[PDB]
């Protein structure tokens, strides 16, 4: 049990670290998805707004 605990603790710590890595990667995806939307729909939608004007004339 001491080893099962160290192993479970390694797993708990692993999971805390894995969760930490994923806390970081979820935030990176939360920020990257955010940034990509924020810049991608905002720019390309904007480019379609610009289409409204670009294709006028």
């Amino acid at each position: 049990l001491s080893d099962k605990l160290k192993e479970a603790e390694t797993r708990a710590e692993f999971a805390e670290r894995s969760v930490t890595k994923l806390e970081k990667s979820i935030d990176d995806l939360e920020d990257e998805l955010y940034a990509q939307k924020l810049k991608y729909k905002a720019i390309s939608e904007e480019l379609d707004h610009a289409l409204n004007d670009m294709t006028s004339i």
Binding site: T20, D27, E30, K37, H49
Partner: protein, 50 residues
Amino acid sequence: LNELQALIEAHFENRKKEEEELVSLKDRIERRRAERAEQQRIRNEREKER
């Protein structure tokens, strides 16, 4: 060609409005999910501190 006019505007107006809104609507969802990531970081720190 009323259709070219309908399309030149429908393409632009329907998409810029719907699409740019999805960009910012989801940007907020994403930011909240990123906050969840921060809250998990906080949760991990708190469990270790306890």
